[PDB]
Amino acid sequence: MLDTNMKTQLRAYLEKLTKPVELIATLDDSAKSAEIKELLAEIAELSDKVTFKEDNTLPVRKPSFLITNPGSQQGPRFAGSPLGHEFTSLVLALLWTGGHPSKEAQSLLEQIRDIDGDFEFETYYSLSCHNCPDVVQALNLMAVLNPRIKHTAIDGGTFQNEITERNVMGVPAVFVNGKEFGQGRMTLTEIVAKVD
């Protein structure tokens, strides 16, 4: 759950929201999904621009949630716990989806918006990985920027079966359209270059 520090900090960042943001979760009856429900609950009451609904009907990982805008189905998805060192990533995805501008250069955002082709990214991370945030954040931004680019950040501690199943030896481990894309550090620019 959110610790007093995260909550207070989150409350402060959210003041940057200008558009309404929705957190749509897909849960099961497991304890893990209980945590998520509690967390998305706390987050929603830190701001009136944030709503927490749930559609446990979607053919997606459980638990998981989508960060989007009302009336929209676009945005990055977090499967498992978005805390630990990914908390900054959670904050940023909320901010970006809520209208707050990325610090990236305008010409770069544009190149990202003009990317042709459909890419379904999946990134495995651990709550304690220090090099994962930048990768997760780069792919989240791309998903907020281009509806053709999807991204699901997966907490390895909630989907362990997938870690061995895909033989993930380290994190962050990124996949695109089901196939390995790259592991370890990467920049938004290095990533954008691989997908044209």
Side-chain angles (χ1 to χ4, degrees):
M1 53 154 64
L2 283 172
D3 63 54
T4 308
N5 209 61
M6 296 175 134
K7 179 158 88 166
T8 308
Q9 192 163 294
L10 184 54
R11 202 187 311 121
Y13 285 113
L14 301 185
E15 286 180 42
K16 293 296 185 184
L17 296 180
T18 70
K19 309 162 56 180
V21 179
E22 299 197 319
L23 304 178
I24 303 178
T26 295
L27 309 169
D28 63 11
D29 269 289
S30 68
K32 217 71 181 184
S33 290
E35 295 180 10
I36 306 302
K37 183 270 188 186
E38 292 291 60
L39 170 63
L40 299 186
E42 298 184 58
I43 297 175
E45 51 186 288
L46 290 191
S47 170
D48 65 297
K49 299 275 195 302
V50 181
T51 310
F52 170 33
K53 305 187 297 177
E54 80 192 68
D55 181 340
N56 314 314
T57 234
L58 302 177
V60 305
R61 301 186 171 69
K62 296 186 192 176
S64 83
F65 63 97
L66 164 69
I67 303 168
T68 180
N69 305 106
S72 184
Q73 278 297 298
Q74 163 180 13
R77 175 180 294 281
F78 279 92
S81 169
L83 304 187
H85 289 167
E86 288 309 310
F87 179 64
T88 303
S89 300
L90 174 56
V91 171
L92 287 172
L94 291 156
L95 288 177
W96 302 332
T97 309
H100 196 277
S102 155
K103 306 178 72 61
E104 302 282 347
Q106 189 63 202
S107 47
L108 177 56
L109 304 185
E110 292 181 358
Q111 194 195 326
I112 296 180
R113 289 177 179 113
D114 301 312
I115 284 182
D116 274 297
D118 307 287
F119 304 81
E120 199 194 16
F121 285 97
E122 295 177 277
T123 293
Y124 292 101
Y125 65 81
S126 63
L127 268 30
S128 66
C129 174
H130 199 283
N131 296 186
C132 287
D134 294 328
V135 171
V136 160
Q137 286 165 28
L139 293 174
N140 278 358
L141 178 63
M142 288 167 73
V144 177
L145 295 181
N146 185 331
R148 308 276 294 301
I149 303 178
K150 288 85 178 301
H151 181 225
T152 296
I154 312 157
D155 157 35
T158 301
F159 302 86
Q160 299 97 306
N161 58 297
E162 290 188 47
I163 293 303
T164 74
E165 274 167 36
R166 291 197 185 183
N167 192 233
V168 180
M169 290 299 253
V171 281
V174 185
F175 296 73
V176 75
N177 296 323
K179 308 202 67 179
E180 293 182 3
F181 178 86
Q183 186 175 306
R185 296 181 71 182
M186 36 192 119
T187 64
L188 172 58
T189 303
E190 297 176 327
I191 292 170
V192 166
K194 292 185 65 65
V195 307
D196 293 43

